[PDB]
Design a protein around this ligand. Structure first.
Ligand SMILES: O=C([O-])C(=O)[O-]
Ligand SMILES: O=C([O-])C(=O)[O-]
Lengths: 576, 576
């Protein structure tokens, strides 16, 4: 009556540049509206964003505009997604500024501003080739190790570090630069220490900008603030911080200095990883939004060469925002030509009307940065909902947040990745394990601890262990099996109803050397007392591992079964 | 015809000192033989072992004897296992010497020998309190993270570092001390560089000792070597290395200097972990050998206080050997009183007949250390057998070996622990997934890729995914499900036989937020084409996660089933 089942016998140019085949398919009438509106809006919007993040990264306004313009042009010539906005990312520029400050401290501070670019571009050039190499060799699976609950706590914690850093500009204080682990608390300490020396004009204008922009517009706010700062001596009479002169034109291209490659490679690893994890994602999510497909390898290449050709022209790393991909969505663009228009607008700003924002203050720039972190720092209102869905994901999110906001961004990403992997390990150990009962008028065996009125038979116990059996939870497996049924060691040492134990191995995913040893020891110990142990519903991998580990002899039979019902039927017959 | 199952409603002194109750139960006639033989043999055997490992740890002979004697006495007064030998461990002394050398270099070299003890005892005192604290708070589960394939590659790699270090003494060379990552290759480089300056007498005696001891005795070899070295001017005429004067008596107890606590704590973590992992183990394995039980918490306490009271008297860390637990096994001791005799013998050596080994050379000590690493360095002959049982365990063992033998011992244990956890992660990702077929004249569904003649029905496909569904393997789950059956995205974008898909969730252990989202997306995408997706055999945890994640509405039914047979039956009826 045993179940008998037999085992089975033991186009390169076209791909590189999407626009080669995308231009003929593009229709001017189909994609006309939104492209013109996006170019001026997104472009005028990326001017403040650029001047600010450049100061966040440790540079001047000109280089932020360089990065944005070159990123847009390169992605248009190389990208595949029809809705993504490749430009400056706040978190990436924060990490760039951290590395730039570290190397500046190492060197000691070719002006100091010039040396920032050499470090800044070199980090980006290494980040780009890392993205190119991992894309070419098809080693892009490393994205699977960064979840959406770690890459949403890293961006909610790094948003506090960007708002703390900007708190200097909002309050009009010339605070010293703070770096390393614990920079957030130290900067706040300096803020409260020097709060008496805050500029009255800077505080007034920052309060007005916060009270206007937050309820609400960004472009008109920038225009109004610049106009108010102009036609006045507040740069001297009020001694308020001013953006200053923005150099015009394009400087000659400079090859990144290869003297700094070994120092900047380690940070470039994190830069490239987050840059492709946060792009290939919002490029796939938006592709699913509009019902089209995006090539992950082509995104790899596009975001890789977006950090090399710009890197030759004094630019830092570029990545998709999803904080300005929404501005261009609201615009209504239906093609990547809009970005070109944006680039054109940036070009129209880069050499022409460049000193028009000379009088623009820094407090307004900080306020603009503040009213754009709203999204990430509002992820707090979703905490109870996250707790309801999954408590461990909530814990991982909070740990990543606290680590990134208090122990540097890079250490706060490595703490997130490792903690998530250990949380999976923690889920494996101390797992669910319970007896099973028979469902009346059926052949289904379910947990007698989760379902009621489950019929069980005296003398036979069915034990289910959900997790895989390996070195981590072998002791837990033995302890649970002994807590249920009987403890063979205790009965043997005491000697010196129950007669059959069935283990349901359906949920066991794999077996380690310790797991094979644990199963053999369990069977031998129970057989010493006079109990027979039958394994049921072992997957083919577990069956092969047991056969390789010599759990049973070839001549021996009546030991492994394909179903719990078959094992129960065999045990009842043997007792008779 | 659906299965309807209802869910269930939502003695302190006696324990501290085993000898209080073990002495009255002890019988002199029952445990008489072996105790006397062990004391002299194990004791005379622990004299060379002590003088050598002390030089391995960076100290003089007197302190090794201190450590061995005090460890034996303390474990007799506190230990529970009746067969374990608590004394000096080669790997532990190697790590102690590494930390001692690091602090010696930091300070710069109270004689230099005296400062070694202050660092040596302080490391041990912190290691002991860590074992005491983790035992008292019942946080001893940390042992589960060190497998028997990592703690057997760490001890096979650290055995090469001990044999390389001893290669200096075998060849009679005064090589400089090498430390840090890559010390093994550097020391071998120095050996080959200075091979021309090797002592002829030291080489001759080391070759003779190697050719005699290895085929075979250790005690008589020590006696013969000491006698040959005595009554001769080879210490001067041949300029051979000599152990030297061993101080007699007991020095006054010295409290460990608390100035070095923060520097030595990090190494003390590894010292305490390996010390209790390699003891509670060979104390449980030997207990199972002789059919008795050992209290893990009492072992925690005994091995913890074995590193505190000795630590007050110029002693370093103590741990069970299982390299001299076999010598005392062969003796035939049946109680812990034998260790006391050993301690007595050590005492008889510590103040009396101490200069009897003054003329003993160091080459013979190195040879004795060499012919005792045989066990760990013979674990190479078991490599093919390990490969047959489990390839991943073999890879973990080799990686731990290479890391410990080439990148320091502590880094080689942390590399082993992390790689094993990632190997479990690697086992989860890229897992097994295949279609299932129906077994004829039964109700068992098995893989159609592993079993032959499995009947399947057109229009209905049963898909099994072995691993848990979470952020790491969500993309793999979607890709596998699309490779089998049909790819809903491609059919939808093309439009712009198969009609039912059953997913067997029996092997799925848990579901992450990404897993719940992946399942919902899969169901929606297939329902768009016109395919119905039914989940079957979901464990109660997965069912609760789906209910919490709002996978199905309360009013909605015919979506989750308790068995694949029930799901198949329902699908056939619906098609009719
Ligand atoms: O969730 C994400 O990936 C993010 O926001 O960066
Ligand atoms: O396997 C072990 O635990 C050892 O030998 O240390």
């Amino acid at each position: 009556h045993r179940i008998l089942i037999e085992r089975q016998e033991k186009n390169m140019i076209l791909g590189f540049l999407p626009v080669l085949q995308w231009l003929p398919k593009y229709d001017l009438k189909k994609n006309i509206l939104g492209d013109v509106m996006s170019g001026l809006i997104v472009g005028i919007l990326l001017v403040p964003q650029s001047i600010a993040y450049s100061l966040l990264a440790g540079q001047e306004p000109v280089y932020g505009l360089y990065t944005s313009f070159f990123a847009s042009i390169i992605y248009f010539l190389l990208g595949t997604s029809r809705h993504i906005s490749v430009g400056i990312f706040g978190v990436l520029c924060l990490m760039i500024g951290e590395t730039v400050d570290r190397e500046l401290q190492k060197a000691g501070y070719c002006d100091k501003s010039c040396y920032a670019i050499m470090v800044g571009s070199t980090v980006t050039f290494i980040a780009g080739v890392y993205q190119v190499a991992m894309g070419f060799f098809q080693v892009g699976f490393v994205s699977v190790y960064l979840s959406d609950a770690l890459l949403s706590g890293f961006v909610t914690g790094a948003s506090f570090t960007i708002l703390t850093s900007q708190a200097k500009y909002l309050l009009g204080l010339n605070l010293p630069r703070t770096n390393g682990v614990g920079s957030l608390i130290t900067t706040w300490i300096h803020v409260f220490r020097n709060i008496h020396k805050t500029n009255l004009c800077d505080l007034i204008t920052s309060l007005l900008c916060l009270l206007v922009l937050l309820p609400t517009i960004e472009l008109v706010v920038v225009v109004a603030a610049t106009l108010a700062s102009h036609f006045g001596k507040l740069h001297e009479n009020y001694n308020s911080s001013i953006a200053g002169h923005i150099p015009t034109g394009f400087m000659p291209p400079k090859v990144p200095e290869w003297n700094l490659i070994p120092s900047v490679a380690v940070d470039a690893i994190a830069i490239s990883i987050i840059g492709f994890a946060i792009t290939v994602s919002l490029s796939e999510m938006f592709a699913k939004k509009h019902g089209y497909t995006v090539k992950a390898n082509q995104e790899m290449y596009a975001i890789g060469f977006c950090n090399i050709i710009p890197s030759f022209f004094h630019c830092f790393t570029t990545s998709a925002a999803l904080a300005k991909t929404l501005v261009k969505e609201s615009t209504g663009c239906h093609t990547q030509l809009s970005g070109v228009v944006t680039a054109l607008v940036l070009l129209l700003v880069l050499l022409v009307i460049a000193p028009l924002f000379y009088s623009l203050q820094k407090s307004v720039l900080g306020v603009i940065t503040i009213v754009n972190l709203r999204g990430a720092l509002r992820k707090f209102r979703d905490l109870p909902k996250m707790w309801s869905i999954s408590r461990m994901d909530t814990v991982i999110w909070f740990v990543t947040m606290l680590s990134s906001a208090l122990l540097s961004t890079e250490i706060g990403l490595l703490v997130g990745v490792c903690f998530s992997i250990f949380c999976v390990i923690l889920r494996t150990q101390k797992p669910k394990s319970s007896l099973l009962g028979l469902v009346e008028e059926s052949e289904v065996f379910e947990s007698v601890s989760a379902y009621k009125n489950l019929q069980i038979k005296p003398g036979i116990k069915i034990f289910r262990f959900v997790a895989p059996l390996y070195y981590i939870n072998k002791e837990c497996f033995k302890s649970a099996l002994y807590k249920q049924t009987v403890n063979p060691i205790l009965i043997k040492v005491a000697w010196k109803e129950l007669h059959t134990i069935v283990i349901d191995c359906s949920a066991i995913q794999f077996l380690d050397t310790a797991g094979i040893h644990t199963l053999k020891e369990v069977r031998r110990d129970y057989e010493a007392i006079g109990i027979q142990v039958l394994l049921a519903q072992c997957n083919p991998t577990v069956r092969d591992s047991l056969t390789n580990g010599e759990y049973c002899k070839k001549e021996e039979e009546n030991l492994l079964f394909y179903s719990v019902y078959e094992a129960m039927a065999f045990a009842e017959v043997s007792k008779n």
